[PDB]
Structures are given as C-alpha cells and as structure tokens.
C-alpha cells in the first residue's frame with residue numbers, strides 16, 4: 001500500500017552515515033527496490049503534496065528530446081535552472097539520449113520509438129530497453145543520468161516497467177521519479193494497446209540528505225490516503241501528448257513540505 | 261540463505277507461460293532481486309556443481325577486452341562457441357564495452373579502469389558504473405548484453421556490487437553470472453584495498469526454459485550446503501590476474517546436472 005514510505009523509513013533507521021559531494025550528511029543504503037501495482041492506483045504520493053505539473057512538463061520535455069530549459073520556462077518550470085548554462089544548455093541529457101543517441105554510423109537512435117515498436121510487434125522481447133547512460137557523453141552533461149536505464153515487460157497484455165536509478169534523493173527526488181515513470185508507463189501502454197502492470201523502482205545509492213531528516217520525520221507520521229487516478233486523452237502518437245491531455249483525478253494529498 | 265533456489269522455486273511455481281526468441285517455451289517473472297553477503301561465503305552454488313574454471317576464464321576474457329573466442333579455447337572453455345562467426349568473432353560484446361566503449365569522438369573509454377580509480381580516489385561517488393549496453397553498437401553484437409550493467413558502492417571499507425541483468429536463463433546462465441560478478445567484486449575490492457560487502461542481483465526477464473524443468477525439480481529436491489571461500493593471490497593490477505591466482509576452498513556441491521542450451 002505504501003512502498004515508498006516503507007523504504008523511506010527503512011533508510012532513516014538502517015541507513016549508514018556518509019558524505020556526498022556536495023551537500024551534507026546523508027543516511028544511505030545500496031540496492032533497494034520498491035514495487036507498485038499500477039492498476040491499483042496512480043502512485044502520486046498522498047503523504048505530501050507533490051508538484052505534478054512540474055513532473056508532467058518535465059517528461060514531455062524529455063520526450064521532445066530537448067536539451068535546453070527554454071521550453072521548460074515557457075511553462076513556468078524551473079527545477080532545472082540550477083545547472084543550466086547562461087544559454088540554458090544542459091548538454092546531451094535524458095531527452096537527448098532517449099530520442100537521438102548518437103550512434104557511430106552518424107545515425108541518431110530514437111529509443112522511445114524503438115521500444116514502442118517492439119511492444120507492438122514483439123511483446124515478448126527481452127530487449128525492450130531505454131538507456132540514458134551514454135558513457136561517451138557523460139562528461140558533456142551538466143549532470144550524469146540519475147534515473148539511468150529502464151526496461152519494459154509484457155504479461156497477459158499488461159505493461160510493466162522497471163527503472164534503475166543509480167542515485168536517489170529519497171525525499172525530494174524519488175517522489176518525482178515515481179510519478180514520472182508511472183506516467184510514461186501509462187503513455188507507452190496507451191500507445192501500444194496494453195494495460196498497466198507493475199512499476200518496479202530499483203535504486204543504487206538510496207539516501208536521505210542531512211537537512212531532510214526533519215522534513216522526513218513529519219511525512220512518516222502522516223496517514224496515507226487512497227491513490228489518485230490517471231486519465232489520458234486519445235493521441236495518434238506518444239510525441240503528440242500535451243499537458244492538457246493529462247488528468248489526475250481524486251488526488252487528496254496531505255499538505256506539502258518544502259526543503260532545499 | 262538460498263536466494264538463488266528461492267527465486268528458482270518462485271518462478272517455477274508462479275511464473276507466467278511465455279513465448280521467446282529461442283523457439284522453446286518459458287515460465288517468466290519480471291523484476292526479481294537476489295542478495296548475497298559476500299563475507300559469509302563465495303556464492304558458487306552447491307545444489308549443483310558449477311564449473312568454476314569456465315566462470316573464471318570467461319571473466320578474465322571480458323577483462324582483456326576480447327571478443328574472439330580463441331583465447332577461451334586456448335583454455336578449454338567452449339561456452340560461447342555457438343554464437344561466434346566462423347572466425348570466432350562475437351562482435352563488440354561485454355569486454356569490448358568494459359575496456360573500450362567507443363565515444364562519439366572515436367576514443368575508447370576504459371570503464372573498468374575508470375571505476376577502480378573512483379574507488380581508490382572517491383569511494384563515496386554515486387557514479388561508479390560500468391555499462392555494456394551500448395545502444396550504438398548492439399546490432400553489431402552477436403547477442404545483446406544479458407548482464408547489462410553494474411554499479412559499485414562503498415561503505416565502512418566494504419565494497420558492494422549491484423548488477424542489472426535484463427534477461428535471465430535461471431537454470432543455465434544465472435549460476436554463472438552470480439559467481440562471475442562475485443569474483444569480479446573480490447577483484448575490484450582487492451585492487452581498491454577494500455573488503456567485500458554484498459552482491460545484489462537484479463533481473464528484468466527472469467525465466468525457466470520449459471526443457472529445463474525436470475532439472476530444476478531435481479535441483480530443488482536437494483539439500484543446500486554451505487558456500488565455499490574464495491582465495492585471491494596478490495597482483496598489482498586487476499588486469500594481471502590469472503586462473504592460477506583464483507582458488508576455491510571447501511566447495512562440495514551436489515552432482516552436476518546437464519542441460520541443453522537455447523540458441
């Protein structure tokens with residue numbers, strides 16, 4: 001019922017102290033897994049109000065294959081401002097690798113299209129994968145991919161997705177990541193003629209920053225309300241979805257909780 | 261604990277019947293995780309005999325950046341034979357991505373060396389990653405990487421390793437993969453002056469081929485025995501290890517179980 005919350009606790013209590021770079025004292029565990037049944041409800045956390053608008057616009061940004069934060073500002077989103085050059089450039093990050101990974105043939109590979117094609121023509125493939133982790137381009141990126149790698153799986157006409165996040169800011173980061181991929185999974189499924197199955201979150205370094213220990217103590221004290229429902233409009237193509245094509249119904253979150 | 265055997269039993273008992281590339285059949289589950297505390301023993305399975313010589317030579321071959329089976333034959337190992345071209349070539353697989361992943365500028369990136377570095381120099385880093393999944397080059401490979409990529413993690417002078425394995429032949433392949441990465445981890449740990457921690461195995465498509473089922477049942481009827489210990493001789497470079505340096509102690513498995521591979 002509350003995969004995320006259980007993991008947050010377990011890291012607050014069992015987590016090992018550790019410095020990062022840069023920041024303060026994180027408590028940390030390695031190799032942790034959360035599991036969501038997407039048919040049961042959309043995993044937008046109810047123990048704290050999550051800024052879904054930012055989540056959606058960011059994913060649409062990723063899907064546009066966009067490297068600049070311009071289109072993001074146009075819609076009043078600023079979560080990326082702090083790493084963007086004077087020009088607003090971030091380098092060949094997520095969207096760039098997703099939509100146009102630079103092969104050695106000079107070709108650009110659209111992994112999203114390729115994945116979706118597989119889903120439609122060869123649902124049983126074990127190669128339905130997208131990787132943002134481009135070793136050749138990590139050092140051109142403002143920041144190396146955090147949610148680095150993901151895979152899809154079909155079973156009884158139900159689409160599952162497992163994500164691998166190498167580094168996980170549990171309190172401020174992961175909530176976004178859960179909703180984000182949850183949304184993506186609804187979109188691929190919708191485009192491919194499938195239903196939603198599971199979302200599997202697999203983390204590398206799972207960490208609660210030093211500041212956030214208080215922000216987090218509160219959030220664990222709150223009782224979890226029933227999950228909201230995700231709705232989508234019809235579109236001929238994943239790349240045609242707009243923010244206006246998305247609705248989150250019956251979302252009743254406990255009040256927000258700020259933190260740097 | 262017997263995490264391998266539990267997963268195997270679990271997939272057998274609850275897996276979904278599925279079709280596949282190899283034209284055989286499968287029971288399958290998605291997103292499963294095995295965990296091993298490497299300080300309690302080297303996870304060379306004991307409910308069947310696993311041929312360590314092969315696991316070890318395959319590993320040393322990856323480390324050489326080698327994609328031709330010739331060196332493996334030089335040492336009697338034949339497990340990659342039915343995928344190689346007539347010249348023994350497999351394409352830019354595993355090691356070639358580990359030692360020399362070709363960047364857009366052309367340059368070969370040595371990820372294994374990069375990783376050691378980060379371990380010796382910045383153990384807390386969350387970017388200690390080696391990837392075989394070169395989107396750019398997968399078509400060029402005889403097969404796409406099953407053990408697709410891995411991360412290292414340090415805490416209290418203990419080295420942990422998590423592998424993501426996109427596709428898991430539970431009976432035939434996984435026992436090889438568990439041992440191999442456990443071995444690499446000991447290696448990376450020796451070279452960074454660290455002790456071993458956990459090996460965490462995370463699978464995408466976890467499957468038991470339909471022609472492996474009588475073997476899986478035999479194996480599951482057996483009583484698990486304590487894991488052996490691994491002894492590594494000293495070397496000054498991960499790239500200088502030899503089989504001679506890699507010794508197992510107290511490994512008493514139940515008998516080996518033969519099984520037909522799915523091409």
Ligand SMILES: CN1c2c(nc(N)[nH]c2=O)NC[C@@H]1CNc1ccc(C(=O)N[C@@H](CCC(=O)O)C(=O)O)cc1
Pocket residue numbers: 050051054078079080083143169172173174176257258259
């Ligand atoms: C995800 N990323 C990230 C990071 N650095 C850290 N420590 N954690 C992260 O999740 N560097 C790059 C990147 C940029 N993405 C983000 C996403 C959300 C917020 C955040 O502040 N969310 C608030 C809502 C405020 C926002 O809508 O403007 C929240 O409590 O959810 C910051 C950076």
Ligand SMILES: CN1c2c(nc(N)[nH]c2=O)NC[C@@H]1CNc1ccc(C(=O)N[C@@H](CCC(=O)O)C(=O)O)cc1
Pocket residue numbers: 310311314339340343403429432433434436517518519521522523
């Ligand atoms: C892992 N790989 C693999 C694959 N194809 C399939 N269907 N499954 C796999 O695991 N293609 C490439 C590769 C080669 N690795 C292997 C590893 C072990 C065996 C096998 O036959 N093991 C037997 C005998 C051990 C020794 O004699 O080789 C055993 O029961 O372990 C075959 C190919």
Ligand SMILES: O=c1[nH]c(=O)n([C@H]2C[C@H](O)[C@@H](COP(=O)(O)O)O2)cc1F
Pocket residue numbers: 021144146147166167168169170172173174177386387
């Ligand atoms: O998808 C986001 N979620 C995640 O939490 N990271 C966090 C992890 C880490 O705390 C920081 C990246 O720094 P590092 O490269 O050291 O892991 O951003 C950022 C991504 F964009």
Ligand SMILES: O=c1[nH]c(=O)n([C@H]2C[C@H](O)[C@@H](COP(=O)(O)O)O2)cc1F
Pocket residue numbers: 126127281282403404405406407427428429430433434437
């Ligand atoms: O890491 C090794 N073991 C792993 O289990 N695969 C197996 C899994 C799979 O059944 C087969 C390749 O099938 P596919 O490419 O269709 O996923 O190789 C092979 C690798 F070399």
